[PDB]
Amino acid sequence: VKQVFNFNAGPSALPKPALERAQKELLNFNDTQMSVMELSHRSQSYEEVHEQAQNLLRELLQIPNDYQILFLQGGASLQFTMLPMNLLTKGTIGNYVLTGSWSEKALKEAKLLGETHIAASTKANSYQSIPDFSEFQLNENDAYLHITSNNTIYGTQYQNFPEINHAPLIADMSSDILSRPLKVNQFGMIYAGAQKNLGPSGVTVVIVKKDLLNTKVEQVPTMLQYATHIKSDSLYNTPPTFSIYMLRNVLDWIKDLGGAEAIAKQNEEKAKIIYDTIDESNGFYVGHAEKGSRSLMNVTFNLRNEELNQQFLAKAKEQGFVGLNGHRSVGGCRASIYNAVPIDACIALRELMIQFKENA
Amino acid sequence: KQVFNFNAGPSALPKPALERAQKELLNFNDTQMSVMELSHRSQSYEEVHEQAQNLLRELLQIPNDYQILFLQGGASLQFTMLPMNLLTKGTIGNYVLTGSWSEKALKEAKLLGETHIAASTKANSYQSIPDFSEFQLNENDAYLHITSNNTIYGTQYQNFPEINHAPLIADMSSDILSRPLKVNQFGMIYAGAQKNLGPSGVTVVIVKKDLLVEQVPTMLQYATHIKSDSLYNTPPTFSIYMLRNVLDWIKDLGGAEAIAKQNEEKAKIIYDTIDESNGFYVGHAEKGSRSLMNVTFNLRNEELNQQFLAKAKEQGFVGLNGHRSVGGCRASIYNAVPIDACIALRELMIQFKENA
Numbered sequence: 241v242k243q244v245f246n247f248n249a250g251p252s253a254l255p256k257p258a259l260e261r262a263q264k265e266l267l268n269f270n271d272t273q274m275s276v277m278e279l280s281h282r283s284q285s286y287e288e289v290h291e292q293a294q295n296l297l298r299e300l301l302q303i304p305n306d307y308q309i310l311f312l313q314g315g316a317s318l319q320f321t322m323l324p325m326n327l328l329t330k331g332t333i334g335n336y337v338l339t340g341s342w343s344e345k346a347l348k349e350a351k352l353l354g355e356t357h358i359a360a361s362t363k364a365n366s367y368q369s370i371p372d373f374s375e376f377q378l379n380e381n382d383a384y385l386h387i388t389s390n391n392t393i394y395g396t397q398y399q400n401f402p403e404i405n406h407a408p409l410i411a412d413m414s415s416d417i418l419s420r421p422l423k424v425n426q427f428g429m430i431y432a433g434a435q436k437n438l439g440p441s442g443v444t445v446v447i448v449k450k451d452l453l454n455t456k457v458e459q460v461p462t463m464l465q466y467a468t469h470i471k472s473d474s475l476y477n478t479p480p481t482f483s484i485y486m487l488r489n490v491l492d493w494i495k496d497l498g499g500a501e502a503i504a505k506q507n508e509e510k511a512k513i514i515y516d517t518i519d520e521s522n523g524f525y526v527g528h529a530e531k532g533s534r535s536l537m538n539v540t541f542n543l544r545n546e547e548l549n550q551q552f553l554a555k556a557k558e559q560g561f562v563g564l565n566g567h568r569s570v571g572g573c574r575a576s577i578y579n580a581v582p583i584d585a586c587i588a589l590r591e592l593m594i595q596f597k598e599n600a
Numbered sequence: 601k602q603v604f605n606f607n608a609g610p611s612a613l614p615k616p617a618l619e620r621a622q623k624e625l626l627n628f629n630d631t632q633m634s635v636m637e638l639s640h641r642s643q644s645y646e647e648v649h650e651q652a653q654n655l656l657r658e659l660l661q662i663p664n665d666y667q668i669l670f671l672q673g674g675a676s677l678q679f680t681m682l683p684m685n686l687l688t689k690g691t692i693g694n695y696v697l698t699g700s701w702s703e704k705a706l707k708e709a710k711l712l713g714e715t716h717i718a719a720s721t722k723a724n725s726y727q728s729i730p731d732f733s734e735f736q737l738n739e740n741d742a743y744l745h746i747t748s749n750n751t752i753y754g755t756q757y758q759n760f761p762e763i764n765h766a767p768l769i770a771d772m773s774s775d776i777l778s779r780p781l782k783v784n785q786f787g788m789i790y791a792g793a794q795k796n797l798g799p800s801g802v803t804v805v806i807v808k809k810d811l812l813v814e815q816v817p818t819m820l821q822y823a824t825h826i827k828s829d830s831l832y833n834t835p836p837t838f839s840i841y842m843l844r845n846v847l848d849w850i851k852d853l854g855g856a857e858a859i860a861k862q863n864e865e866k867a868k869i870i871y872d873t874i875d876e877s878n879g880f881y882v883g884h885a886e887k888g889s890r891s892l893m894n895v896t897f898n899l900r901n902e903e904l905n906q907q908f909l910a911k912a913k914e915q916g917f918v919g920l921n922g923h924r925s926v927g928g929c930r931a932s933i934y935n936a937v938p939i940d941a942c943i944a945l946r947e948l949m950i951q952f953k954e955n956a
């Protein structure tokens with residue numbers, strides 16, 4: 241039929257081969273004559289999938305052996321409270337770097353549970369950049385330092401990560417995990433809802449330094465202890481089996497295209513097509529982020545006024561573009577260009593942007 | 601290539617629901633995207649989300665003063681979310697123990713507040729549901745919690761107690777929507793979808809609205825999800841999609857009364873087989889408490905138990921091993937397990953007995 245260009249911000253485009261693979265075996269997985277959705281998570285067929293998803297992640301991000309990979313339910317949002325529930329103990333401080341709305345949501349949940357601090361913030365200038373690591377106010381009693389690697393709503397992204405030695409560095413990487421190589425040992429824990437760059441909604445990937453968190457925290461509900469899930473290899477209660485399966489399939493695809501290093505090359509190229517379009521528009525399009533902080537995953541911009549914003553977005557939707565409206569809290573436009581968004585979608589968007597500009 | 605899916609959780613699903621999912625997996629509702637590729641704030645997703653709620657409301661005849669929530673974390677997270685929200689100081693989380701899942705729920709409540717055992721058949725290894733006249737209730741109960749179907753022990757409430765001093769709360773994970781329900785008897789009902797309603801990954805919570813909070817984490821307040829119609833954060837969109845599909849299948853076959861007829865016939869096949877076996881197969885549950893959802897039984901000794909389960913597996917039956925905690929055998933016959941599978945099981949049971 242007509243063209244569809246999927247710029248959805250979460251859940252988002254999946255790589256076709258992962259979907260085609262799921263479709264072909266949906267009724268009969270691994271010759272069992274059952275859907276993977278109909279299997280016991282204690283079955284060897286499911287356990288294979290569960291272990292393979294872990295091993296693919298390990299290999300792709302080169303995760304060290306003293307880290308474990310958890311598959312949890314509840315989304316990144318649940319991690320906002322689970323993290324301080326496990327690590328924010330009395331006398332300690334949950335220290336946050338604010339670089340957008342998701343950072344503020346994380347902070348808010350720690351405030352419910354303990355002492356918090358703000359190490360640095362670009363909130364005053366509306367989160368157009370990542371603050372300089374030299375401006376980080378650190379405390380000796382910090383339980384951790386928490387960052388948001390990619391600020392999904394504002395379109396900014398860490399280019400590199402701080403060296404932290406007084407507390408564990410924690411990162412919400414929901415919208416850029418496995419979009420590039422990562423030195424995992426810079427962190428105590430990384431978490432990401434899978435639905436932006438790793439697959440389907442319904443599972444949350446948590447990579448954790450085992451010894452920081454494999455111990456029982458007195459007074460914490462069993463399901464909310466990291467220890468529970470570490471000990472049981474994320475099989476304490478019933479896992480989201482189809483989501484983990486689809487995550488596996490997506491990881492296989494990333495591996496098949498050459499891994500994190502290759503996908504970073506693709507992601508820089510797609511991003512460049514859009515930012516060059518903005519940058520050659522003589523101010524017709526204005527990117528939210530400062531240039532040194534531009535996200536490779538979520539491109540945020542405005543036209544010169546709200547009327548043009550609306551006409552642009554209406555025209556896009558009529559031409560087959562999906563998900564370009566900015567987050568409801570900030571307006572404007574947002575082109576989400578996660579791993580699986582194809583480059584010809586980006587070229588299509590550029591064409592839209594240039595004809596709209598020329599004909600305005 | 602014969603396979604009979606008696607898995608206890610996750611479990612068999614209706615073929616039409618899986619076939620429908622397969623067919624549109626790449627192009628949902630002419631959007632040219634998978635349902636998995638849609639934004640949860642899209643109208644496309646929002647209609648699916650609401651359709652799943654609507655079908656549950658219709659099929660269980662849920663009154664307007666109840667809300668239907670779709671949450672993550674399984675029934676296991678409900679074990680702690682419930683007392684987190686309702687077990688206020690000076691009140692008591694009162695539990696009726698009818699199996700090990702009952703025990704797991706009570707344990708989480710003990711973390712958060714005062715608890716109590718209204719009644720328990722544990723001493724007799726959970727062979728039955730206690731008589732309601734035996735319940736010990738308290739003026740300051742925050743709730744009375746029951747497990748409607750005791751998945752590991754094979755017993756099930758035939759009916760529910762009339763409780764007016766506090767909300768009745770029920771873990772219906774392994775029998776929700778296997779028969780008609782009077783939802784007005786309850787303040788809350790919860791169930792992981794993965795036994796009777798859909799794949800794993802979503803938990804259905806039916807809650808009396810006005811029933812349910814300073815200092816509880818945002819994600820763990822029922823009010824958060826009620827207020828946001830379970831769209832506060834990203835829901836498990838594919839699992840809710842599949843739940844919708846399963847609910848359409850149940851509606852199509854005639855609803856909760858029709859599926860009860862099928863379920864009673866399935867359980868009748870197995871229990872008759874056991875009862876007519878002259879003690880060769882022995883059911884764990886007392887007759888009056890027999891579950892229609894999980895049929896638990898053993899052979900006369902462990903070696904015959906093992907020979908049977910081995911023979912079953914060779915013949916294509918999946919999931920019949922009993923829970924590790926109790927051993928024996930367990931035939932899970934949730935909604936989507938077809939009558940033909942139970943007939944096959946019967947025929948295997950009868951042949952095995954003859955050939956022993």
Ligand SMILES: *Cc1c(COP(=O)(O)O)cnc(C)c1O
Pocket residue numbers: 250314315316317318342388390391392412413414415433436833834835
């Ligand atoms: C979308 C998003 C979240 C929310 O994730 P849920 O799975 O919806 O809880 C949190 N952090 C970031 C950076 C996100 O982009």
Ligand SMILES: *Cc1c(COP(=O)(O)O)cnc(C)c1O
Pocket residue numbers: 477478609673674675676677701747749750751771772773774792
């Ligand atoms: C299976 C089951 C549970 C556990 O559900 P999860 O989704 O695995 O947490 C709880 N209660 C009952 C009655 C069950 O059968």
Ligand SMILES: [Cl-]
Pocket residue numbers: 339340341342343390391392393394395
């Ligand atoms: Cl943000």
Ligand SMILES: [Cl-]
Pocket residue numbers: 249250392393567
């Ligand atoms: Cl977002």
Ligand SMILES: [Cl-]
Pocket residue numbers: 698699700701702749750751752753754
């Ligand atoms: Cl039980």
Ligand SMILES: [Cl-]
Pocket residue numbers: 608609751752923
């Ligand atoms: Cl069970």
Ligand SMILES: [Mg+2]
Pocket residue numbers: 492495496
């Ligand atoms: Mg490969």
Ligand SMILES: [Mg+2]
Pocket residue numbers: 582584
């Ligand atoms: Mg193409």
Ligand SMILES: [Mg+2]
Pocket residue numbers: 848851852
């Ligand atoms: Mg119909």
Ligand SMILES: [Mg+2]
Pocket residue numbers: 872
């Ligand atoms: Mg008879």
